[PDB]
Amino acid sequence: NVRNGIVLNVTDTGIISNEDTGFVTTFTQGDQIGLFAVKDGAILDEINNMPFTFNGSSWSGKPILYDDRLVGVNFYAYYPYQSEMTGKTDLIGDDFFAPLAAGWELTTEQSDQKAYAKQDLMTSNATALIGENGNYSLSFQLTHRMSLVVVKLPSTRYIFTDAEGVAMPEETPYVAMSVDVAFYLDNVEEGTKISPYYDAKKDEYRLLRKPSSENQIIGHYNDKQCTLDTAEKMKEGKYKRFVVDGGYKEVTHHLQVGDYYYADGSVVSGNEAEPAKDNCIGIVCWVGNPMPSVLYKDVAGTPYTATNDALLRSHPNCVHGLVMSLYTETGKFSPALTQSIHDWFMTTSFTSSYVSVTGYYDANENNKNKPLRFLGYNNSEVLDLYYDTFKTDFECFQYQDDCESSFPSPSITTGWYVPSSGELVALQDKDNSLESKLNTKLIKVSDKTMDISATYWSSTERNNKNMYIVTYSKTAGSAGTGGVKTNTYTYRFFLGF
Amino acid sequence: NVRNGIVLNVTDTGIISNEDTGFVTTFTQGDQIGLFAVKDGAILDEINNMPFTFNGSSWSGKPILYDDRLVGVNFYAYYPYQSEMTGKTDLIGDDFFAPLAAGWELTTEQSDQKAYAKQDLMTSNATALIGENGNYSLSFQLTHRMSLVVVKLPSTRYIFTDAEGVAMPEETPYVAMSVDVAFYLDNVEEGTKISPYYDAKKDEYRLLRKPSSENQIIGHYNDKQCTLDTAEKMKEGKYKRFVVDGGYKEVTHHLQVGDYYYADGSVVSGNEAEPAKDNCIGIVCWVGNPMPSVLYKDVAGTPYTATNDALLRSHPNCVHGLVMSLYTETGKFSPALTQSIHDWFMTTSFTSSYVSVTGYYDANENNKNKPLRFLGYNNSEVLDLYYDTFKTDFECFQYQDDCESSFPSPSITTGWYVPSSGELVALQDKDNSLESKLNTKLIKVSDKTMDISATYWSSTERNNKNMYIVTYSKTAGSAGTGGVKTNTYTYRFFLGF
Ligand SMILES: [Cl-]
Ligand SMILES: [Cl-]
Ligand SMILES: [Cl-]
Ligand SMILES: [Cl-]
Ligand SMILES: [Cl-]
Ligand SMILES: [Cl-]
Ligand SMILES: [Cl-]
Ligand SMILES: [Cl-]
């Protein structure tokens, strides 16, 4: 920091409620401000739209050295810096940045941090230099020149419990959030669609608007609509929050196998006599934490640890259970390969961070134990790594895409995957849970049940030509090695939540 | 109230904690006290163990008229009045009732209000007459001379909920209380068994003991034991409360068909992998309020009202559901009758307060609707009224006794009864709930399941010779009229809770 060099500080006064701290900008590396110095009614040539960049810790630019000529000077700052400021300042009026604000062109494309930030105009009023004996600073207070729309759609936290009301352990709240969300300006049309900023942490949408604007914003979500009347609520530097149908709420639910699972992540009791078919994407088929490093923590030699647990790494919040798709089709899995996915995998740098898809040649578990483990999510990630290398369009990827297209998985889940042979075998028990707990629900929300006499694909590999395939009796599932990749068997997809 | 007649008031100072108000006696109609008047070191012949009886509002006896001779007189009172008080008072010592207390014989037979009250010795100290100008009163403060043991065994309130944790409506708390309760003095033997007073309102046992007594009291309950060391805790006019294994506690439970039901009224989730067989008496087979005036409140002509609802009248707290017995046997129901129970019933004064047992000749409901109603509890009470009149030992009463002997029903339930044909038909649905929800539980706690091909007795009468009998397919129950009372069919008992 140059001797006699003026230090720059920038503070956002924040966007406050039209009716707390409000929305205060903290700034980030790369943000730029412009600085002006006005002396005796004229901008100083040396400090005329001078840019300063935030590096994550402080504001840097060309040093401004203190001089006695800076006594009585009015300093002004604005964000975001504009290369062209000709005619954007006013020396006569009482608002130096009045033309910048008047001509500020705001669009409805604000869906990412950069698209929003570049439109969030902030300015200071006349600021004095503080200091003496070579230690000087400029500390600006910035105010937002636009207005802000905040939308809070309805959401539901589920506290999943056992039959005694004891909450199951989790990493973060499980929240069902609105789906098929679209916002429109004044009327619903493809050309009037607007793109607000989605705050995933607060679960709310934000949109900068010109002060005194009066448009209706139409929101579509789930299967309904709302009208957000912004007229008279668009004050400069202030926000209006629209809470739609109660906003956030919390419920408790005894999570059980057979419960109905929906596109927004909501769950309905499997005892429901008339379940809604709309947006139903599957049935809860297993309750508990399905991470292999949790399930198999006490297995001899600890073959599953946090280091090689892809599910724990990619979706640490999915500790409640598994869902089976209403989706079902018959088809091929992949072409017959020269080199198995297992054999390819063992030649890569991924052997410490993933588990092989093989049920048969695993280095840590024998061919009796490995096909019984819950590893479908792992297997999907290993198959994605294989795809990234060879770009072979396996038929299983097309069925996965089709399941996702017809029954979109919630963003809070793993997404759909072909279950491992272990996950499929666990669908059946000695009390015929497949027919009694699953098919009795499937028939209420779908025209297809899980045929107990059918053969099901797993994502567990036998060799270069075969997958493990699962069959059932009325008392057990059985993982067999005869699943020739080019044969036709039945698909059911799973997701973790 | 006689002019110049002294008014008597009696107040118990109460039994207080050895370590609130404590246990304060309020007195009841028929209670008697004895009164003494001591003048110049001698008992007055006119007021020597004079009895006074409480009538529910006031104390009455032979009137005591005020006289100047009563100035300076010491009055004493004790409870309960004894016809013989010779040598039971002390004029020399500072405690007038010291010999009464010293010779007081206390037994361990205190199981009813009268057996307890007759042993609860209470006395006053010297009391002065209050008043002037013909208005006088004697207001005694009585203190308990014995000590008191209070035992609080463990109990569990169940707040039964649906899958969303919403409490089901109820009239009073549902509480599982200890069973097979027995107390013994010093050691366990048939001859050392003691009978304390059971306070059903507070769910606790009380036993008067001599002050400074030191016996261990051994309590047996459920399948365990406790030792109550009374040594050093038996102070005159004070109680010691022993809280066994935490005493009263509250839990919440999602009540479902298939849940395991126990002898103490406790319920275990039907999802339990290893249910306890010990004290299991049945399976929850229906959830909800089973009172016919509630279930059928909207039926045309309102055939079921509070006036003719025997279940609501006798067990108003049984609004949670029904349980089916683990018990099952085959046998006859009754002899063939000349006059049906229905035909007998219609000639009685009970036709407005009960529903007929007939499924076929009901005056308000036709023969298609009447056999589908839940009326087994009603039917048991009508059959008891028939037994009270004719004293015929029907075989169904012997099977009921046998079920109760092997699987005792909790005191908070209806007790076991033969289900109506309507209750049996509701055990099966289109998703084969009989085999999937009931038999899968029965096989874990019993060696017998409900055979879907068997024929079951109901308590619904067809005519003088036949009962309705229920058969099942994999999709429905069917109530048939071919149940000749002297034929052999299968019994399953139900209870309401
Ligand atoms: Cl920010
Ligand atoms: Cl909210
Ligand atoms: Cl089979
Ligand atoms: Cl297997
Ligand atoms: Cl009392
Ligand atoms: Cl307690
Ligand atoms: Cl059938
Ligand atoms: Cl029928």
From Swiss-Prot, chains A, B:
The keyword Membrane applies. It holds the Pfam family Mfa_like_1. Keywords: Cell outer membrane, Fimbrium, Lipoprotein, Membrane, Palmitate, Signal. It comes from the Bacteria. One of its GO terms (cellular component) is pilus. Its main location: other. It is found in: Fimbrium; Cell outer membrane. Probably a component of the fimbrium tip. Fimbriae are filamentous appendages on the cell surface that mediate cell adhesion and biofilm formation. May be part of the fimbrial tip. This is Putative fimbrium tip subunit Fim1C. It comes from Bacteroides ovatus (strain ATCC 8483 / DSM 1896 / JCM 5824 / BCRC 10623 / CCUG 4943 / NCTC 11153).
